[PDB]
Amino acid sequence: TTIVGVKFNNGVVIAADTRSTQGPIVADKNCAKLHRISPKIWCAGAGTAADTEAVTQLIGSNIELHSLYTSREPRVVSALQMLKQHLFKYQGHIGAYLIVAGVDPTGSHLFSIHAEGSTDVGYYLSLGSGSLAAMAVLESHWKQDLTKEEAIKLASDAIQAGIWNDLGSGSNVDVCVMEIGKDAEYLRNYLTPNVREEKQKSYKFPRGTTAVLKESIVNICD
């Protein structure tokens, strides 16, 4: 994976690639690494795929209950605290590496969490196997006082660096923009720079090609 997060004027934007691997094999060419914890708090997750989804869902569930209990919109620091303490408890065995971002009554926020429970704060962050390609771009083009459209450009450029240069990353760029005072906009497949070319041939077989021993109707009704 390559994942990034970038702060701007009036909020924060996160992005991710869409490749899922099992060793050298691409298992999923268009998987969703951007997770909704609450309406305006979103997570980008690298590491063990089932872990990032489960830990994101569990804390998301508990955040919803907390929001209902307190009659308040959830805060990013709450999701941050709950995630880090859960991950720390499991001493790194839950392999979730997360970039946590969002807006709340306190403002806009950007954090990252490591599987063992460490957190950090920044204006720009990147995690995953393509984080070095991404961070190289971020360290080259980031500046203070970015606009919304500048931050999206920077974030997706950082993801592209991972897509092209990291074998762990590929396919498409997903983006989520969380601006203060507005609804979070999830941009699924914001860029699709890896469309498969037309195949040279149709491999549609003449009907009857496959030898068959038996046929039978399967009963699915009661």
Partner 1 sequence: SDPSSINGGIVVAMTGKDCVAIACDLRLGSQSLGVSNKFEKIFHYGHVFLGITGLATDVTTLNEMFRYKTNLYKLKEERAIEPETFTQLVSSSLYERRFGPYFVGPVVAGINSKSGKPFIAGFDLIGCIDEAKDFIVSGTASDQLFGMCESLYEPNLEPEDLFETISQALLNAADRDALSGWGAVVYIIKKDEVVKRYLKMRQD
Partner 2 sequence: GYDRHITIFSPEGRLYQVEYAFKATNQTNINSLAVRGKDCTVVISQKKVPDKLLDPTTVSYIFCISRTIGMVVNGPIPDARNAALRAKAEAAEFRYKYGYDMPCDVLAKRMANLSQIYTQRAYMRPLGVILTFVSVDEELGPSIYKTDPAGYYVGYKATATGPKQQEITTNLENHFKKSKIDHINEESWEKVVEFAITHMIDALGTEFSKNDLEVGVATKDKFFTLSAENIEERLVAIAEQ
Partner 3 sequence: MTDRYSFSLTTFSPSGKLGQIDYALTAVKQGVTSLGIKATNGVVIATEKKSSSPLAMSETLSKVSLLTPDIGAVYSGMGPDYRVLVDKSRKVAHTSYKRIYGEYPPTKLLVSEVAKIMQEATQSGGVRPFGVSLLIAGHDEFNGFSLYQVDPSGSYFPWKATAIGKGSVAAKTFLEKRWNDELELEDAIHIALLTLKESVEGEFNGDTIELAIIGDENPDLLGYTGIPTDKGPRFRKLTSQEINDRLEAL
What span, in angstroms and rounded, lies between the C-alpha atoms of 82 and 69?
Answer: 16
Distance of CA 160 to the CA centre of its chain: 14
In this structure, are residues 96 and 58 in contact, taking their beta carbons and an 8 Å threshold?
no
The Cα-based distances of 101 to 75, 81, 149, 194 in angstroms read 10, 13, 17, 27
Residue 49 contacts partner 1 per CB under 8 A? yes
Segment near partner 2 (CB under 8 A), from 63-71, 90-98, 137-145, 185-193? 63-71
Q: Note if 1 is an active site residue.
A: yes
- For partner 1, the closer CB: 143 or 199: 199
Residue 144 contacts partner 1 per CB under 8 A? no
Query: Least CB distance from residue 124 to partner 3, whole Å?
Result: 22
> x/- string (CB under 8 A) for partner 2, residues 70-109?
xxx--x-xx-xxx--x-------------------xx---
- For partner 3, the closer CB: 38 or 126: 38
Query: Which member of 1, 2, 18, 56 is catalytic?
Result: 1
What span, in angstroms and rounded, lies between the C-alpha atoms of 87 and 153?
Answer: 32
| Contact footprint for partner 3 (CB under 8 A) | 36, 38-40, 57-58, 61, 64-65, 68-69, 71, 176, 183-188
In this structure, are residues 61 and 17 in contact, taking their beta carbons and an 8 Å threshold?
no
The Cα-based distances of 96 to 29, 36, 49, 151 in angstroms read 20, 15, 8, 25
The entry of partner 1, partner 3, partner 2, none near residue 147 (CB within 5 to 8 angstroms by kind) is none
What span, in angstroms and rounded, lies between the C-alpha atoms of 76 and 79?
Answer: 5
Q: Known catalytic residues?
A: 1
- State the residues that interact with partner 1 by CB under 8 A: 20, 22, 25, 27-28, 31, 48-51, 53-54, 93-94, 199, 202-207, 209-218, 220
